[PDB]
Design a protein around this ligand. Structure first.
Ligand SMILES: O=C(NCc1ccc2c(c1)OCO2)c1ncc(Br)cc1F
Length: 300
């Protein structure tokens, strides 16, 4: 089978200091639960996506409850059927991206110190009025699941090879510079849907989340209630104000961080600039495997 060929083409163990329940770091209890859940899925008829990394993501998502995790998996499979996710990399074509990239900037640029692909989202700059001139929110969400499928199929394997260990997760940087109460309400619908797709259909894919240029009240609230979030979440999520450069550089090598966020990585304006760039390990022949090089989101 070619799923066998694929998972053998990149490192499959997480580093030993990763949170427990991750691949390669399983205690006796968890080990039993994993094949127990697998058996049920096999019995239920599933053939696809029954690998350790996948099943453990759902397991870690339901505190290792084998039954709730089966529900989660089944629902996701149903969604993949209805939504058409298994074929989205062929069917969907976001050809309007060049026109609307400035309106809502979203790009993947290199990796962080743990080998995770970095996702940049400049939400603060969002201008939906201009965007809705050319696209719909239905189309914005397809592009989200398209990018997501790109990460799973092409970005994460390449990142795994480039780092020497399994990379299951992305590192998200969300820039609020420019956000207002007006525009906040205007993107709530999209963010809420994206959040639902993320948690329910792509569990445990979020590894680091940085919000930068947060407004004072938002920044403050997090600071005050920090002592009451569980320590696993408090190590994944960072809400930062206007001085985030040193915080980003602890997580992303300066050579991989865009100059505009305080690093050295540059992108030629000849290729459409950073808003249209997709640079990383997934574009390097040394780290591309039997999956082949990933697609590009648009024609040009
Ligand atoms: O969880 C993820 N990203 C974190 C995140 C960060 C901001 C968001 C969001 C999700 O959904 C809405 O806004 C996430 N990352 C990569 C892949 Br593939 C799937 C995902 F669900």
């Amino acid at each position: 089978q070619q799923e066998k060929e694929f998972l053998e083409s990149y490192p499959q163990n997480c580093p030993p200091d990763a949170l427990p329940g991750t691949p390669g770091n399983l205690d006796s209890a968890q080990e039993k639960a994993l094949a127990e859940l697998r058996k049920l899925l096999e019995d239920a008829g599933f053939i696809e996506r029954l690998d350790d990394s996948t099943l453990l993501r759902f397991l870690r998502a339901r505190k290792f409850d084998v039954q709730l995790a089966k529900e989660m998996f089944e629902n996701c499979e149903k969604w993949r059927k209805d939504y058409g996710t298994d074929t989205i990399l062929q069917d969907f074509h976001y050809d309007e991206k060049p026109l609307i990239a400035k309106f809502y900037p979203q790009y993947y640029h290199k990796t962080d110190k743990d080998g995770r692909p970095v996702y940049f989202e400049e939400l603060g700059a969002v201008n939906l009025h201009e965007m809705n001139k050319v696209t719909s929110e239905e189309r914005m969400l397809k592009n989200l699941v398209w990018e997501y499928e790109s990460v799973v199929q092409y970005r994460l394997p390449a990142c795994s090879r480039a780092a020497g260990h399994l990379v299951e997760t992305s590192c998200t940087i969300m820039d609020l510079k420019g956000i207002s109460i007006s525009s906040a309400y205007s993107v709530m619908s999209y963010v809420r849907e994206a959040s639902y797709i993320s948690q329910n259909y792509y569990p445990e894919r979020m590894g680091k989340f940085y919000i930068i240029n947060a407004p004072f009240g938002f920044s403050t609230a997090f600071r005050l209630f920090k002592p009451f979030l569980d320590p696993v979440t408090v190590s994944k999520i960072f809400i930062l104000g206007s001085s985030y450069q040193k915080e980003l550089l602890k997580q992303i090598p300066a050579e991989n961080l865009p100059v505009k966020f305080g690093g050295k990585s540059e992108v030629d304006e000849s290729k459409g600039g950073l808003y249209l760039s997709d640079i990383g390990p997934w574009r390097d022949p040394k780290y591309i495997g039997p999956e082949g090089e990933a697609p590009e989101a648009f024609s040009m």
